[PDB]
Amino acid sequence: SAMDDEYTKLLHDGIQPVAAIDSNFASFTYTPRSLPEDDTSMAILSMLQDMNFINNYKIDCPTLARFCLMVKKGYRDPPYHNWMHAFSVSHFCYLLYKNLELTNYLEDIEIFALFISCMCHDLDHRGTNNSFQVASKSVLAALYSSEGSVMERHHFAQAIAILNTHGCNIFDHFSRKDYQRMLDLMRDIILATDLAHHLRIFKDLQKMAEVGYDRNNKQHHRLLLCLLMTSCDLSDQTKGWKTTRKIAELIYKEFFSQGDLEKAMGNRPMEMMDREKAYIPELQISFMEHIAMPIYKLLQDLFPKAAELYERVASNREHWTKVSHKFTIRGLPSNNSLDFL
Ligand SMILES: Cc1cc([C@@H]2CN(C(=O)c3ccc(F)c(I)c3)CC(F)(F)C2)n2ncnc2n1
Ligand SMILES: [Mg+2]
Ligand SMILES: [Zn+2]
């Protein structure tokens, strides 16, 4: 009944103009996690409208309203992999569209697929990684472990199950070829969110950047969609220091909860998931240096207007070194007690 009332307003009230969400809503400086969660579904509609996807693809408004609410309802509430993560990832896709001239690189249907994939790309996440699915013999590993990217295959399958819910197929008027194309793009883009996939294709991304993007090269389109998806997925790191500090807290809370479950199963967790061994500053610097910084450098190499994103990530990485000393206990604890020994 709650979704029904939310649906009724979303459909009949009208789509708010994107500028009424916030004055800097289309800026790389805007933090979409500042928007109250109760306003995010309308914000999704506003972005789809402002990108002209509703008109261009003649999307049925009742179907779109139901679809957006169903996607939102398809996320659980772990500390990090929740609807506010998917919303902020989608918002960054919108920022790329508004700031980087994607229509000079990608087909319209590819840009639309990227945005919809962003909304769906972590559907039904349980706060555990792919290794945990296999180690815990979960149902998801039973379905997908032979293929790899267990969680990402589940996210895609959940997106399809939403489309296959009566009243929710935003694409059901597409031609057969266009429908097939959209679902194939969603498959490739969602599976691209597995960081292991990113690391496998990284040298191909570098080679594409070095030689120059070729808009007539079908493999270049595919590689660019992967890089853009990853850039949206990691985009919290392109914001201010306070955003990245909070996101670190949410990440480690989720990771350490997984590690607690592994220890209760008799398995030694990954160091980054073991609250007794993980040293957060060192781990964030390693993640920033080896994963996040190279991604935004590739993006800057392909889009010179993305330079500010890379500089922000590098700045945040240097901030971690500046605060590292605070993880050492100087003097006595604030309670004046050594009881923790
Ligand atoms: C925006 C953002 C997203 C993520 C993670 C990265 N991921 C990892 O597997 C991972 C790999 C190597 C590492 F050294 C660490 I630490 C984590 C996957 C994910 F957990 F889904 C989200 N982190 N992690 C730290 N700061 C982040 N900021
Ligand atoms: Mg994911
Ligand atoms: Zn994600």
From Swiss-Prot:
Outcome (variant: residue 236 to A): Decreased 3',5'-cyclic-AMP phosphodiesterase activity. No effect on 3',5'-cyclic-GMP phosphodiesterase activity
GO cellular component annotations of the record: cytoplasm; cytosol; endoplasmic reticulum; Golgi apparatus; mitochondrial inner membrane; mitochondrial matrix; mitochondrial outer membrane; nucleus
Expression sites (tissue/organ): Widely expressed. Expressed in brain, with high expression observed in the corpus striatum. Also expressed in heart, placenta, lung, skeletal muscle, kidney and pancreas.
Family: Belongs to the cyclic nucleotide phosphodiesterase family. PDE2 subfamily.
Disorder this protein is connected to according to its UniProt record: Intellectual developmental disorder with paroxysmal dyskinesia or seizures: An autosomal recessive disorder characterized by global developmental delay, impaired intellectual development, language delay, and early-onset paroxysmal hyperkinetic movement disorder that manifests as sudden falls or backward propulsion, eye or head deviation, and dystonic limb posturing followed by chorea and dyskinetic movements. Some patients may also develop epileptic seizures or only have seizures without a movement disorder.
Positions annotated to bind Zn(2+): 85, 121-122, 233
Result of altering residue 252 to A: Decreased 3',5'-cyclic-AMP phosphodiesterase activity. Loss of 3',5'-cyclic-GMP phosphodiesterase activity
Phenotypic consequence of residue 244 to Y: Loss of 3',5'-cyclic-AMP phosphodiesterase activity. Loss of 3',5'-cyclic-GMP phosphodiesterase activity
One GO-annotated biological process of the protein: cellular response to transforming growth factor beta stimulus
Protein name (database record): cGMP-dependent 3',5'-cyclic phosphodiesterase
Gene Ontology molecular function terms on file: 3',5'-cGMP-stimulated cyclic-nucleotide phosphodiesterase activity; 3',5'-cyclic-AMP phosphodiesterase activity; 3',5'-cyclic-GMP phosphodiesterase activity; cAMP binding; cGMP binding; identical protein binding; magnesium ion binding; phosphate ion binding
Result after altering residue 283 to S: Loss of 3',5'-cyclic-AMP phosphodiesterase activity. Decreased 3',5'-cyclic-GMP phosphodiesterase activity
Impact after mutating residue 272 to L: Decreased 3',5'-cyclic-AMP phosphodiesterase activity. Loss of 3',5'-cyclic-GMP phosphodiesterase activity
Domain of life assignment: Eukaryota
Keyword Ribosomal protein attributed: no
Annotated catalytic residues: 81 (proton donor)
Residue ranges annotated for the PDEase domain, each copy included: 4-327
Keyword annotations: cAMP, Cell membrane, cGMP, cGMP-binding, Cytoplasm, Disease variant, Hydrolase, Intellectual disability, Lipoprotein, Membrane, Metal-binding, Mitochondrion, Mitochondrion inner membrane, Mitochondrion outer membrane, Myristate, Nucleotide-binding, Palmitate, Repeat, Zinc
Residue positions binding Mg(2+): 122
Classification lineage: Eukaryota, Metazoa, Chordata, Craniata, Vertebrata
Function: cGMP-activated cyclic nucleotide phosphodiesterase with a dual-specificity for the second messengers cAMP and cGMP, which are key regulators of many important physiological processes. Has a higher efficiency with cGMP compared to cAMP. Plays a role in cell growth and migration.
Effect of residue 252 to F: Loss of 3',5'-cyclic-AMP phosphodiesterase activity. Decreased 3',5'-cyclic-GMP phosphodiesterase activity
Effect of residue 237 to I: No effect on 3',5'-cyclic-AMP phosphodiesterase activity. Decreased 3',5'-cyclic-GMP phosphodiesterase activity
Comment on protein domains: The GAF 1 domain functions as a dimerization domain. The GAF 2 domains binds cGMP, which acts as an allosteric activator.
